[PDB]
């Protein structure tokens, strides 16, 4: 979720993962990834 993807050091992003980073896990009910 949101929060815990900004409180574990990620950003939730709808596009694909920037570079240096992957998905883990979701945010926005589910729609957007959070990338780290």
């Given at each position: 979720d949101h929060y815990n993807c900004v409180s574990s050091g990620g950003q939730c992003l709808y596009?694909?993962?920037?570079?240096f980073t992957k998905i883990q896990g979701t945010c926005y009910r589910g729609k957007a990834k959070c990338c780290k």
């Open positions: 596009s694909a993962c920037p570079i």
